[PDB]
Write a protein that binds this DNA or RNA. Structure first.
Ligand SMILES: Nc1ccn([C@H]2C[C@H](O)[C@@H](COP(=O)(O)OP(=O)(O)OP(=O)(O)O)O2)c(=O)n1
Ligand SMILES: [Ca+2]
Ligand SMILES: [Ca+2]
Ligand SMILES: [Ca+2]
Ligand SMILES: [Ca+2]
Ligand SMILES: [Ca+2]
Length: 901
DNA sequence: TCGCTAAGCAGTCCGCG
DNA sequence: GCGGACTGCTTAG
């Protein structure tokens, strides 16, 4: 096989590399790598190395990496550019793996672990590690085994061995319901004392040294706790055995308002799953506890136990160990679904970076661009310091707040990467500048043509047309990979809809789900067989279709995230190719594009309708426009349509056959106007929306910018079995909105869009009447909690104290003198509830850690004093008032003359 | 929360005769 | 009460 790296590190003048050799074996080596860097040189000096601007360079080969680093410093001292890859491990990877890396995940040791620490006096601080580690579960991907290290004797209690038999049993049999499919994969090791547990764990670690190390909060908790605990008991040299090169470093992670410490383990790639999830999932969650995320992702119930976690080991050690094992498995289950590890490996190996660098788009693109340029013997420029300066972004049209009955949306494909490729935007393709007219003059095609030679953006920039820049070349490669995965995602989605349709008529028979590839549209044969299947087989197929869609989503959305990240990195001062001229060339071109095409669509539709100056485009944001289709529908007349699907087909055909060709013509003219290198403004129909035929539904509404709701029948070619609400920006979409309130507001919107005013009034009356019965957690607001200390003046709110922070201060007073009570953690999320006048907490609200029940110490009082009235007005009534006012609708029936009978 | 801009709403403080 | 200046937070893209 082709060899591939696992990890790479620089330690002084040595590169330490763990890799898979040509026989599939894991190896380690120390290489005394001599790096090269570059200086500009005279024309007369014949060279094969040129900087990105075509200026000649001489290569300087250093005796060692420290010499190269010293040279960089001296060049700064002199005031001359030191060119080349200054991150020597990336240069090493480039030299050692000079080909597209083909990797084999089955040879990469992926370790998933979780530790337990019993702590009487509150949260066990990983920098102190003052409490024994009493359980470790460590899953190894190569062995496919869960290794359980169980401490039976502790100063906090001696316990009996954990029983796998009881663990397997149902909760209803007194068991722990450890999933049967992992029961045979558990390797249980009880220990008489902590020292032998930890020593054996290190020997195990040495035999089975993780390459990728993950779990939940492993970087912020488990890793530093294990390191520091071993350090405290045995000394530093023993703790450093967690590194295959015996090198570790305390790394201080700084933010706006403080800092924290993590432990860097040289020769290991830590990908904490909580951070992979935050980066790659595109969710914003009210809580990031593993129980909360597992419930959300997997629909598995919360792990239930009695008493506080600090007494679980002594009261129920059996459950304590079982829950440690389940915790590790939950993460593997999330990954089986989301496939973020697979994604990280794909991106890391593509860029030729340390796998953990996937968290940094700057580092990822730096390595991609470096490798690409190196292929042509070109030399990368030195990074420079730049002051942070704001720059303009996208255009967002101000909508007229209203109901909108029939709506068709159109969307530019991968806008910013397409702009980059179209205009040819790159550090080395800058050709010069032209005199800019106001943007509106370009939008209306009245400004002078920028250039007859170069490719232009309306910010005043001109670019070469003879050859692609490195940024367009490399962005195109990832754009093209994404396209394939988006295709699989959309096919799986369409396939899902076929199964949902068939589920209306399940057959009374015993059968199996079909063995099919959900990444490809079902053939007619598969479709025939589906129509004959039972509900059991159909639901199983639906689950699989949906899992395939998720896999496609992960692969495609994060590839999109990376290429959009390149556009954004051009405006980050730490990027090697930072240039506000280029960053702004992209965004300003985007503003023109959207407003240019708005004008073109209005002009086209006014022509077909035989009108003048009517606004068909009701809204736009960045890369999309929303077109009112009422007049198109009315031109044939609603009576002419057999059903909803009939007018959806008609609008689908109108968009594809009439509007898209008109949009294309409009954008080709714009390309010529800007003299761009290649026309790549591809704007396709996105959504078709409206009320069910013959209903009183309003179809859609806008309240303002980035705030709207549509009843959608077709999205990007997916024809839904049932209409889907597309709600953007409204309170139903915000993690801050109470769970039950999101749900109620969503149903109010559904009724508005699908059924009309009377249906809405019916539901509102019932909700208002019954909501006081809702569970307190379901009606609590959520907020991130920053700067708690800043606003804390002797336990009371300081000037300008935010509402959620006030609530935390209230909580803190109420739990004062309890080392046991859960503490609110700076920077994390809290639930927030309002309190009625004259309550014993002495303030108008209380807040406690999100994803948890409030402590029993005060729960009864909180429930008794909760202000339901304030809760309802603020979270439900006020947003609903916004929705209905915009839609020109009433949520309460107004009095009429009919009331007199 | 270690790892692009536009823009919405909640809440504080205080003016507005 | 509402709105503007301001902080804080969370969206859409
Ligand atoms: N983090 C982000 C997100 C978006 N955008 C900009 C660039 C995008 O091109 C544009 C629209 O983003 P979308 O994700 O809505 O869709 P794209 O057009 O990028 O991709 P698709 O091909 O899915 O339409 O907004 C950005 O600069 N940075
Ligand atoms: Ca735990
Ligand atoms: Ca788009
Ligand atoms: Ca599209
Ligand atoms: Ca059937
Ligand atoms: Ca869009």
């Amino acid at each position: 096989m082709k060899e591939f790296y696992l990890t790479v590190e620089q330690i002084g003048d040595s590169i330490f590399e763990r890799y898979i050799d040509s026989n599939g074996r894991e190896r380690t080596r120390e290489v005394e790598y001599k790096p090269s860097l570059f200086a500009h040189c005279p024309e007369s000096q014949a060279t094969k190395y040129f900087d990105i601007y075509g200026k000649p360079c001489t290569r300087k080969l250093f005796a060692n990496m420290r010499d190269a680093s010293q040279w960089i410093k001296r060049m700064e001292d002199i005031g001359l550019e030191a060119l080349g890859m200054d991150d020597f491990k990336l240069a090493y990877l480039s030299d050692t793996y000079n080909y597209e890396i083909k990797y084999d995940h089955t040879k990469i040791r992926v370790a998933n672990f979780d530790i337990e620490v019993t702590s009487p006096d509150g949260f066990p601080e990983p920098s102190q590690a003052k409490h024994p580690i009493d359980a470790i579960t460590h899953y190894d991907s190569i062995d496919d085994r869960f290794y359980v290290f169980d401490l039976l004797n502790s100063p906090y209690g001696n316990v009996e061995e954990w029983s796998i038999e009881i663990a397997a049993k149902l909760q209803e049999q007194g068991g722990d319901e450890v999933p049967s499919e992992i029961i045979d994969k558990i390797i249980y090791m009880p220990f008489d004392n902590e020292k032998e547990l930890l020593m054996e764990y290190l020997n195990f670690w040495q035999q089975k040294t993780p390459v990728i190390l993950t779990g939940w909060n492993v970087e912020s908790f488990a890793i530093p706790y294990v390191y520091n605990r071993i350090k405290n008991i045995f000394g530093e040299s023993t703790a450093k055995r967690l590194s295959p090169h015996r090198k570790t470093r305390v790394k201080v992670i700084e933010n706006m308002y403080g800092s924290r410490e993590i432990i860097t383990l040289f020769g290991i790639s830590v990908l904490d799953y909580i951070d992979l999830y935050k980066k790659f999932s595109f969710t914003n969650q009210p809580s990031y506890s593993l129980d909360y995320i597992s419930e959300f992702e997997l629909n598995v119930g919360k792990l239930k136990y009695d008493g506080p976690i600090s007494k679980l080991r002594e009261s129920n050690h059996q459950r304590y160990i079982s829950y440690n094992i389940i915790a590790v498995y939950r993460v593997l289950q999330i990954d089986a679904k989301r496939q973020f590890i697979n994604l990280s490996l794909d991106m890391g190996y593509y860029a030729k970076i340390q796998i953990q660098s996937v968290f940094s788009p700057i580092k990822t693109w730096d390595a991609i661009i470096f490798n690409s340029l190196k292929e042509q013997n070109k030399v990368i420029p030195q990074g420079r310091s730049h002051p942070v300066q704001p720059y303009p972004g996208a255009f967002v049209k101000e909508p007229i707040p209203n109901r909108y009955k029939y709506v068709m949306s159109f969307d530019l494909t991968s806008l910013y990467p397409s702009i980059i490729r179209q205009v040819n935007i790159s550090p080395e393709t800058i050709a010069g500048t032209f005199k800019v007219a106001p943007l509106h003059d370009y939008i209306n095609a009245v400004a002078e043509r920028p250039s007859d030679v170069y490719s232009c953006s309306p910010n005043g920039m001109m670019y070469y047309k003879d050859r692609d820049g490195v940024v367009p070349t490399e962005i195109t490669k990832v754009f093209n990979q994404r396209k394939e995965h988006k295709g699989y995602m959309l096919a799986a989605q369409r396939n899902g809809e076929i199964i949902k349709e068939a589920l209306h008529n399940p057959n009374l028979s015993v059968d199996e789900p079909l063995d099919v590839d959900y990444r490809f549209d079902f053939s007619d044969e598969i479709k025939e067989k589906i129509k004959k299947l039972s509900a059991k087989s159909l639901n199983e197929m639906l689950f699989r279709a949906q899992r395939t869609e998720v896999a496609g989503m992960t692969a495609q959305i994060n590839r999109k995230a990376l290429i959009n990240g390149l556009a954004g990195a051009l405006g980050n001062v730490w990027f090697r190719y930072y240039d506000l001229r280029n960053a702004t060339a992209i965004t300003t071109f985007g503003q023109m594009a959207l407003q240019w095409i708005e004008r073109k669509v209005n002009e086209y539709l006014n022509e077909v309708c035989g009108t003048e100056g009517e606004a068909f485009v009701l809204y736009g944001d960045t890369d999309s426009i929303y077109v009112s289709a009422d007049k198109i529908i009315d031109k044939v007349g609603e009576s002419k349509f057999r059903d909803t699907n009939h007018w959806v087909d008609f609008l689908d055909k109108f968009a594809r056959e009439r509007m898209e060709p008109a949009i294309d013509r409009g954008f080709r003219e714009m390309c010529e106007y800007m003299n761009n290198k290649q026309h790549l403004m591809f704007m396709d129909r996105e959504a078709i929306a409206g009320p069910p035929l013959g209903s009183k539904g309003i179809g859609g509404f806008w309240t303002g910018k980035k705030r709207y709701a549509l009843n959608v029948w077709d999205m990007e070619g997916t024809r839904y079995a049932e209409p889907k609400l597309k709600i953007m920006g409204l309170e139903t979409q915000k993690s801050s909105t109470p769970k039950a309130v999101q749900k109620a507001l969503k149903e109010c919107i559904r009724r508005m869009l699908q059924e009309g005013e009377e249906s809405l009034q019916e539901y509102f009356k019932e909700f208002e009447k019954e909501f006081r019965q809702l569970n307190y957690i379901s009606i609590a607001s959520v907020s991130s909690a920053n700067n708690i200390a800043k606003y804390d003046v002797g336990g009371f709110p300081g000037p300008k104290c935010p509402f959620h922070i006030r609530g935390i201060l209230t909580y803190n007073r109420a739990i004062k003198g309890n080392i046991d009570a859960p503490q609110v953690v700076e920077g994390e999320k809290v639930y927030v509830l309002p309190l009625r006048e004259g309550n014993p907490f002495g303030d108008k609200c209380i807040a406690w850690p999100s994803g948890t029940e409030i402590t029993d110490l005060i729960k009864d009082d909180v429930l008794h004093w909760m202000d339901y009235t304030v809760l309802l007005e603020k979270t439900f009534i006020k947003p609903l008032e916004g929705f209905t006012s915009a839609a020109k609708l009433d949520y309460e029936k107004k009095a009429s003359l009919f009331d007199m009978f």
